[PDB]
Design a protein around this ligand. Structure first.
Ligand SMILES: OC[C@H]1O[C@H](O[C@H]2[C@H](O)[C@@H](O)[C@@H](O)O[C@@H]2CO)[C@H](O)[C@@H](O)[C@@H]1O
Ligand SMILES: OC[C@H]1O[C@H](O[C@H]2[C@H](O)[C@@H](O)[C@@H](O)O[C@@H]2CO)[C@H](O)[C@@H](O)[C@@H]1O
Lengths: 661, 661
């Protein structure tokens, strides 16, 4: 006990402490190592069971197949309902296979008088497992050489294509041993595949007769939702919609002192007007929000709200519940700090003084919005709050409603960043922005999965906080380039408003902060004119999102594969879908300014073709079709197209094993 | 629950199912990831406990240090007694460090008055934890930071190295969190470091007046033990000493039919004379064995017996207990087979018919020899017997006597080979023989550990069954080369008798079987003449083992590191000892025939030196000394020396950190 060894099971996360991640309709590949004594054959069955919903802290049997690696068995299952699933690998020794294969070897050299009876004692014993109806042809197979005679006489009834297939249906299993049980938590598909748009509701004001921005409202914001849907975004992410503190409120450009009219950063949550459960009054009544949400839902979109666990001084909690802060000896509370950033306008919470006190309130707050149709939260700076809290908050929320999803904006070293994902965060921001070399992007891409069992990255081209240097000086071409990279590399990607307008001016050289940042200032934008003057990337983005919807390969984490292109400025990779066999290849240039050309060397095995093969491809932007082979010429001219997104011949029905591991 | 995150702990094997491996006086490096909220400091303590001498199914505290990888903490402990040890990592937040480090920054920019009081309640509260009269210079500091004044005035004793070292012995810990507990099974040092010599007792006969071999006896064999000890071997491994079956006994050169005088293979255990518990009568009474063991013991050596769970037909078990076999329909028992090898002289056992029946008998047998001083067994073909048996047998034996060690001769694909090691085998044979190119050996060497936490390889230059082709035609030079490789790469190595005589003739071209194999035939050898005629590698081997004893670096699994040599035929690697700092470099040629030269590029960081450094080395065979630097000229002439074994400057007391991971 264990009679048959089962080891190195995957996917298991942190040795089973945390469930693995998957979504509905995703092919989940499972593998394990099973072995036993000698050359005696062994087989494994992947046992999948679907439990209820519920959240952590009749069976379905799938046969597994051996492969290249000795003793390593592979399997798959596709979850069809949201919730918690279980799998384990059962190992057994299948005597029939041993006997059959051994006899065929002996059959070639023509006596054997012994083995045949042994077979003959197998199939009837096998017969006990099969129902009297179809039970019978084995006994037919079982009684055609117990009667003496030639060897080839009854090999008929053994090598018959009819009895492996029934035995496949009902197998004769010996020494059955069960492996450990591990769990997968399946979420709705939006957890993996969807595109994000970050907009500031207040910036939808649109100026007055004097050229001065006007504070917008949920009503006006909702007016902008169609153009957004038009670009193909599935989720709209809103900076906090709560009242902005009036004390120590910051002025334009992170200025310490606020003018009387300045608006302050939405992240300075709380004022005498309200807390985390109240809409900032300038935006509108809470019904207005309900109306905005409903508007989005009409267009096929979802709303994601910023969850920032911090307080401005006027926040009711500063008075009503003050245990929740770390108060200095002179009674003041130290302003929030994240090195080297300073947040003079807010207070960090203290989760240790009154844990079940604060815990319950924050749960209360999150639940408020769940009741208003918000089932995706962009958790803000999760790494500066206790891990166990998040683990608690997530499980606590998801158990009442399991369709609630969390995105963790944790720009922090790996152990924390990936660590946080493990606790349950459905998606995580990534280090993506700071990957810009062919080698960096290659590595960033491959790691994507790799870590798929527990991290889903959301690739944002920019955020209000991050205006990468490369975007600053390379002109509109680069904006395309990052967009192509983001959209193709990950199932989930995002964009901060104005990106499509090529906003590229930073506050000072060497900074990553947007000049005249929207956080501190109202920023109406006039998208329409840009469209008219052909200085908008809105069309391109639309075409990018359409492509994603069109090809299911782009909803996959696991299958990215990089092909060699002998140019340091050109990067070429491919994705495929295990289900439909869909297959797509992307080639992009990382230099926005000069045409760059090269020879692209496909790894045909990876694409499901032999090396010598020749095949036809289609360019999804152009529609042009051409014939390609293992080595192909490619030349990319920015200012014509910064990328070729190529539809490739569908991966044959060997899809499932090109997914192995 | 889980306030401070502790994850990715190592060493853990198969997620804790199996204990890790270590020996007495071995430095075991432990690492884990610990993190918490924000920039609040965190610390970890490695907690070691020594339990018993019992075997698987007051605390010692070691502080752990951060390092290169954020949030990753490293530690080490050195077991001083045989038995089962436990370790876990405890994580805590140390507020003092947060406070101190923050203050130094503030101290430079010169009121700030708030923080000082905060410190004051820390050291006081810190002091309460040290309720000893050695406390507290802290109130000296604790009442040296409260009264009004300048900051540097009241920094008094805080920055000065007087209260941290005190805090070091007694620390102020917050949010202490317990990590999971994992176990290490510590064995006697021979488990890792010792050299093996394989000899056939029967071959010590020495001819008669006609030039005909004479069967030897334990008495005569014991006569050869000094010479063996003289070469520096710590263990003598004996093919089975039991009676050889008389039916289907195999003849010289594996011929199927045995002449009346032929001896047969010792692995055909059992005859009407006796079973596994009896000495083959031709060797002598069991007292003779006891005498042989004692002879070895006198010379500093150990005896290891072959444990082969198989039977010849005349074996008493064939009648007395026949449930133990797989009996055919016609009542015969199929002869043992291991593809493609055929073992016509033996019967495989059947472990499923009467498990606790057979289990108990084999335990009985193993136990017999343990009582006769044999505490190392060379388990034979373990992969052809059930895993659970071995797991049981090992745990069952070791619990009565924990100094009993097992070596698994499992030449099988990885999942099995390493799997077998994991469930308890103290050492394992390896694929070593078939690694012969610079890149193959490099990969093989690095893997050694890697897998050290659960596999200890025993590197055999040859075995009675394996006479590698490379030895067949490259002449005495190669025998040196493999010996250098085996002896240096692994703490444990071995050689089969006659290797030192350059026995290089195989039965047919393309085979790995020794011509006129000792298994089937008596082979007395005359070592003395070879010594006299200078055609023996006995001197070299002696010098190799002395070197191993001399430098503790060579008893390490973990520390091998490969340095670049720009010649495909030259391989250069180094080992060091974390304890003493000993450091050694080996450079060998893989080409036995032509002089080969190159530039050797040391990774000085790995050797504990800066790149620009210049240092002195000594050649352990030659005694010559010279000055070297980062890049050095090296030229190797076989037929002079196939290797340079170089003593290098001792790794500084940064030994612990170059062992990290
Ligand atoms: O008002 C508080 C804080 O707001 C902004 O910082 C935000 C940041 O923009 C968000 O992306 C979030 O992830 O982090 C901070 C809030 O947690 C301003 O940049 C900052 O100056 C201000 O103090
Ligand atoms: O006597 C049975 C069998 O003995 C030998 O095979 C051995 C082998 O030499 C040992 O090294 C061991 O590891 O495996 C076998 C026993 O399990 C002969 O090689 C073989 O011909 C003979 O049948």
């Amino acid at each position: 006990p264990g009679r048959v060894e089962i080891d190195d099971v995957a996917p298991v996360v942190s040795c089973g402490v945390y469930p693995a991640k998957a979504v509905v309709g995703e092919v989940v590949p499972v593998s394990a190592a099973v072995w036993r004594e000698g050359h005696e054959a062994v087989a494994a069955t992947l046992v999948v069971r679907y439990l209820g919903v519920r959240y952590p802290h009749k069976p379905l049997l799938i046969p597994m197949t051996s492969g290249q690696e000795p003793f390593v068995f592979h399997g798959q299952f596709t979850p069809d309902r949201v919730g918690l699933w279980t799998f384990r690998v059962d190992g057994w020794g299948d005597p029939i296979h041993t006997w059959r294969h051994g006899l065929i070897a002996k059959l070639d050299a023509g006596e054997l008088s012994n083995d045949l009876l042994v077979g003959a004692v197998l199939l009837e014993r096998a017969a006990t497992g099969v129902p009297r109806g179809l039970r019978d042809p084995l006994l037919a197979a079982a009684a055609a050489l117990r009667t003496p005679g030639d060897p080839v006489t009854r090999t008929a009834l053994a090598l018959t294509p009819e009895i492996e297939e029934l035995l496949a249906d009902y197998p004769l299993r010996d020494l059955v041993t069960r492996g450990e049980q591990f769990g997968v938590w399946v979420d709705r598909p939006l957890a993996r595949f969807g595109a994000w748009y970050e907009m500031f509701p207040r910036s939808t004001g649109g100026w007055d007769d004097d050229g001065n921005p006007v504070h917008g409202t949920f009503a006006t914001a909702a007016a902008e939702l169609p153009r957004i849907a038009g670009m193909g975004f599935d989720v709209v992410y809103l900076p906090p919609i709560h009242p902005i503190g009036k004390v120590h409120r910051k002025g334009r450009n992170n200025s310490p002192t606020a003018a009387p009219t300045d608006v302050g950063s939405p992240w300075a949550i709380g004022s005498d007007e309200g807390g985390h459960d109240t809409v900032h009054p300038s935006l509108g009544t809470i019904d207005d929000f309900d109306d905005f949400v409903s508007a989005a839902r009409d267009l096929g979109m979802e709303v994601a709200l910023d969850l920032a666990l911090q307080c401005a001084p006027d926040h009711p909690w500063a008075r009503e519940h003050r245990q929740w802060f770390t108060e200095l000896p002179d009674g003041t509370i130290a302003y929030a700090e994240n090195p080297p950033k300073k947040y003079q306008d807010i207070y960090p919470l203290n989760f240790d003084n009154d844990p079940e006190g604060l815990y319950d309130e924050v749960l209360r707050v999150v639940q408020h919005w769940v009741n208003h149709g918000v089932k995706f939260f962009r958790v803000d700076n999760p790494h500066t709050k206790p891990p166990n809290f998040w683990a608690w908050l997530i499980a606590q929320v998801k158990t009442v409603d399991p369709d609630v999803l969390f995105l963790s904006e944790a720009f922090t070293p790996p152990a924390r960043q990936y660590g946080l994902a493990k606790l349950g965060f459905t998606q995580s921001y990534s280090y993506f922005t700071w990957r810009t070399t062919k080698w960096e992007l290659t590595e960033f891409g491959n790691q994507i999965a790799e870590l798929a069992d527990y991290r889903r990255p959301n690739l944002f081209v920019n955020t209000p906080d991050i205006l990468h240097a490369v975007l600053q000086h390379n002109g509109p071409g680069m904006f395309a380039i990052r967009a192509v990279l983001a959209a193709t590399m990950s199932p989930a990607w995002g964009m901060y408003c104005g990106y499509e307008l090529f906003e590229h001016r930073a506050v000072r050289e060497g900074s990553e902060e947007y000049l005249d940042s929207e956080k501190y200032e109202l920023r109406p934008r006039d998208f329409a004119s840009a469209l008219d003057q052909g200085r908008s990337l809105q069309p391109f983005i639309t075409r990018l999102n359409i492509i994603r919807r069109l090809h299911p390969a782009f909803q996959q984490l696991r299958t990215i594969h990089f092909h060699h292109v002998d140019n340091d400025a050109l990067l070429a990779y491919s994705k495929f879908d295990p289900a439909t066999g869909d297959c797509v290849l992307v080639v992009v240039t990382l230099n926005a300014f000069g045409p760059e050309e090269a020879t692209l060397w496909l790894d045909m095995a990876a694409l499901g073709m032999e090396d010598y093969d020749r095949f036809w491809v289609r360019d999804e932007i152009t529609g042009e079709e051409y014939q390609w082979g293992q080595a192909n010429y490619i030349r990319i001219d920015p200012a014509r197209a910064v990328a070729h997104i190529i539809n490739m011949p569908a991966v044959p029905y060997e899809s499932r094993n090109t997914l192995l591991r």
